[PDB]
């Protein structure tokens, strides 16, 4: 493998702030992290991203309000969960100012997302919901905005350090 | 002195996110920083805070959208600038997603703040306006969004480290 962690996130929500601080915190701890910063286009997710997932020991998912509003994010998650079943791929979900149960049940913003998918992407929805529901039933961290964010990140990155580095 | 840096910020804007990440970054560089996290009440600014500024080698000001909407922030800033004239207090302003000239000239959100001060705090406005205007003419960093924030922070704290270490070595 190439990376200790693959960072899956919604750029529109958290690219330049939370996920960047998280990315940087991971590196300071010697946790090699892939955080996509390339310009990308096309309807289908980039092969380079699917490969990076496969070459990562684990993924960190930054679930944010509009994460499911991105098809690339969802496809990402389907791939990540495949690696979870088939490889030894560890998965650490972060619920960033979103109710974990909304992700599990696709309610709230996540529900609005899938509503938009009904007419043109109906066949991919099943694998998407399943991957979404599976990831969200894993033990992760529910983060609120009422707390010091660097302490939230330190807690997250220490727990990942313990699981990936201490062996 | 007791601290290398006194962190002045508007809690409501940046307490739990940016200023916190800044705070933590400063600590990592061995920059002893005072960042107020106590419960405080009462109309007048806490004496512990004014003392803290006097016992700090410098202040970092996180100017944010609603900074001037807090009299405590403004009274804070006046003290900071006074220590700057009378003591050897260094001052590093960060313009966090706000236009430096809005601060300097009290336009935009900063102008709106002062409108509200007109009726009950008219007499304090002059030294407040002076402290904002002076502080904003110190060389600092204007931070926009759409930029990687941890890098913005690394850049700021690297510069502050070099400047505080050079100040100390020249003395």
Numbering used by the authors:
A (entry chain B): 22 to 188
B (entry chain A): 22 to 192
Text taken from the publication that reported this structure:
M. rotundifolia is a wild North American grape species closely related to the cultivated grapevine species Vitis vinifera, and RPV1 confers resistance to the oomycete Plasmopara viticola, the casual agent of downy mildew in cultivated grapevines. The RPV1 gene from M. rotundifolia encodes a TIR-NB-LRR protein that confers resistance to the oomycte pathogen P. viticola. The multi-domain architecture of plant NLRs generally involves a C-terminal leucine-rich repeat (LRR) domain, a central nucleotide-binding (NB) domain and either a coiled-coil (CC) domain or Toll-interleukin receptor (TIR) domain at the N-terminus. Toll-interleukin receptor domains are protein scaffolds that regulate pathogen defense-related pathways in plants and animals through TIR:TIR domain interactions.
Here we report the crystal structure of the TIR domain of RPV1 (residues 20–193; RPV1TIR20-193) at 2.3 Å resolution. Within the asymmetric unit, we observe a dimer that resembles the heterodimer of the TIR domains from Arabidopsis RRS1 and RPS4. This interaction involves the αA and αE helices and the loop regions that precede both helices; we consequently define this protein-protein interface as the AE interface. Analysis of the RPV1TIR structure using the program PISA identified that the AE interface was the largest crystal lattice contact, contributing a combined buried surface area of ∼1340 Å2 (∼670 Å2 from each molecule). Within the AE interface, 17 surface-exposed amino-acids from each RPV1TIR20-193 monomer are buried within the dimer and contribute to the interaction. At the core of the interface, His42 forms an important stacking interaction between the two monomers and hydrogen bonds with Glu170 from the opposing monomer. Hydrogen bonding between Asp41 and Ser171 is also prominent and these equivalent residues were also important in the RPS4TIR:RRS1TIR interaction. Mutations of residues His42 and Asp41 to alanine within the core of the AE interface, were found to abolish and markedly reduce, RPV1TIR1-193-YFP mediated cell death in tobacco. In the case of RPV1TIR20-193, biophysical characterisation suggests that self-association, is absent or very weak in solution. An interesting feature of the cell death induced by RPV1 is that the region that encompasses the TIR domain structure is, itself, sufficient to induce cell death.
